[model samples]
Target: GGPSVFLFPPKPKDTLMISRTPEVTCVVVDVSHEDPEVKFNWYVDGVEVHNAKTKPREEQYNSTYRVVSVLTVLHQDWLNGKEYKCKVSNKALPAPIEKTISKAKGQPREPQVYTLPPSRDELTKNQVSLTCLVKGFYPSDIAVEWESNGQPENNYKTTPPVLDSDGSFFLYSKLTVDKSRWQQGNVFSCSVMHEALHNHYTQKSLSLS
Candidate 1:
């Protein structure tokens, strides 16, 4: 019933994290969709405890569906750098997703967003070729996409993830708008999905003229 690496504490950090407490109570870890086909046990240091629940969601969006799971327990048992892991099933993936939390901390860090224009002459500025670079996040995986007026855009090129020296990751996604739609008041956004964000999302907007 607490927050998971991707849901709560909402920040980017290493597999090792410091407790948010001078001293505290219970903390929850919530994980996203897992398969309904199988079952498993919860473990921390090879021992099992009784504090977890799973719920199914019937809604579907963009060909993806989800089921939410919550894990809650006493803060004392979780404090002082502990490790926990859960194996759950998802409807999409052929195999169950494995999640391990060896450390949990309360500190959260935000990603650094930058907008870069493609290499082109000033005369072609109306082409609207832009790239969104999202960097400085832990647990390397991220969902990156583009939107125009809240509508999702499927045609975009996203590069492979590049590992940074500081234990974080960075990726780039580019969006191209035809000169016809590249008007003075148009807005384009490059959104990201990560646990560090309030909506499990964040983005950078570009205003064109």
Candidate 2:
């Protein structure tokens, strides 16, 4: 018969593997009865890449099949924003199906910000510290500021951004204030500026009565 019925269109995803090389995967789901062998071809910048590997087809419900193709490239190449493409073809099909993906420059992913209250032990002291955890952001450049009752706070410290396993960055900032002032039902806020926000800031506030 002709090409199998494409229940799900092909899509590609990229990941950084343990070897530090970036792996790109393309997958498609289809239903076919005659079992004609399908072909998957990979390309980089329009050049054919024969080394791409296609994992074994997986049987699914109602005679459906899942085919996956994985392509691995050097870290530098992925960093350079190279174009990657995958083509799926069958002898009975009039034309091949193709999908392309490329890494965009400075793709801005917003950061997740959370405000952490000081422990009870710290609250017993003359001064207490409030922490703001900034998680899972890209590009590494960030600014953190502290506010007390609508005024900018100067007694604060921020740690350098730490690289996460998923290629993102994590960092924290601490604001130190007098325990008595904090106990007076004051509102404390942590504001963050990142390139992803494009002139906007993310703020997390904490207040205690």
Candidate 3:
């Protein structure tokens, strides 16, 4: 007796597409399969990306087996347009499935301008104060520094913004100058630093006259 062979339909191929915007590059993988338990793996330049089981693995549609995954690349790195690959597999199959490379589209947006508060124009000898204010941003993560006559000073106070009420972020720093520093018309400046925008510095002069 001869061996009996059964013919099965060919397995559908997987697709990998890259979608990008100014701030991020997104990689989407489409897997078409009737089984809901199919597994997916993603790699960027041969390095495995992290996969969290707690997150949803598939897209929501009418289809029984449609899986989609997104990988975001930083704006600076996306300019390189490196090739990325994705692999799809399952326990039922002996060999793993793979998809081709896809590149991101469009260029990143220009960095914005970050503005800091203006330095005090004049200060008195007694109980002098300087406040640095920043606007037009949310979830403030800015770095601030205060300088007196080009030297860093520790005589300062900081107030963090209130999130729930005003829907704005703010920081204030007050510096109390000693009698000697206040009488010489010394220069005081407050500067803010941020990675996404240009640095800003505001300066003031102290006078006793």
Candidate 4:
């Protein structure tokens, strides 16, 4: 006989994620007997989808077995904003234990861009640092580029996007230039690319005042 009850990991009411790529993966885990007959089913918007590729892994220890199922869907269906469900099926289960992605909190937010010139303290030293701050973006995937005048500058460094407690993401890039270039009041531009932006790129420029 299998375990009396199925154990699902601690999860939200509906596990939802925003995919930045064409492929999306959903994982389901359950603890039961080592029975090979146990299976998992995938559904998109309540309709059974058999094309999804699922690989089941069984880790047996003592009398209990841990089953992990991963389903991969590589189609535009995820981009269509459709819901997905994973159902666990076994003879021991009175009914399938279903996990569904049924709710999307809100629409994606556009990123806000800001540029900061070198500070007086930094200017007193040799080289100066310029910074670009990108904030309030959703779905976290962002590309940042720095340019001096119209030419791209590759010496800049950008941190990986970090999620804020407010459900948004923030990142910054810093560029270092010679004191002479900064004193010449060269224009420095920071360009950010995000999906929520209309043109997918927002540029902000800064120069000495």
Candidate 4: give the clashing pairs.
Answer: none
The CA-based lDDT of model 1 is what?
Answer: 0.56
Q: Which is better, 2 or 3, measured by TM-score?
A: 2
TM-score for predicted model 1 compared with the true structure: 0.49
For candidate 3, give the lDDT of residue 44.
61
Which 10-residue window in model 1 sums to the lowest lDDT? Answer: 20-29
Instruction: Compose the digit string of candidate 1's lDDT tens values, residues 53-100.
Output: 756443355333344555553343443345566655434455655566
Q: Give the per-residue lDDT of model 3 (tens digit) for 1-209.
A: 11111111111111111232322122223433443455556666688876422234455474333444445444333334555555656554456666634332333222222323223544333545555555543334345567876788788876764343545355565666665665566666665543224322234443343
Q: Give the Cα error of residue 125 in candidate 3, in Å.
A: 7.1
Tell me how far the alpha carbon of residue 196 in candidate 4 is from the true structure, in angstroms, after superposition: 1.6
Q: Give each model's whole-structure lDDT.
A: 0.56, 0.73, 0.44, 0.67
Over the stretch 170-192, how does candidate 4's per-residue lDDT look in tens digits?
Answer: 99899988889878878888988
C-alpha lDDT of residue 10 in model 4: 18
The positional error of residue 130 in candidate 1, measured at the CA in angstroms, is 1.9
Question: Which is better, 3 or 4, measured by TM-score?
Answer: 4
Task: TM-score each candidate.
Answer: 0.49, 0.49, 0.37, 0.54
Q: Tens digit of lDDT per residue, candidate 2, span 111-192?
A: 8999988898887799998899998887665678899878999999999989899888899999989988788888999988
Report the backbone clash tally of model 3: 0
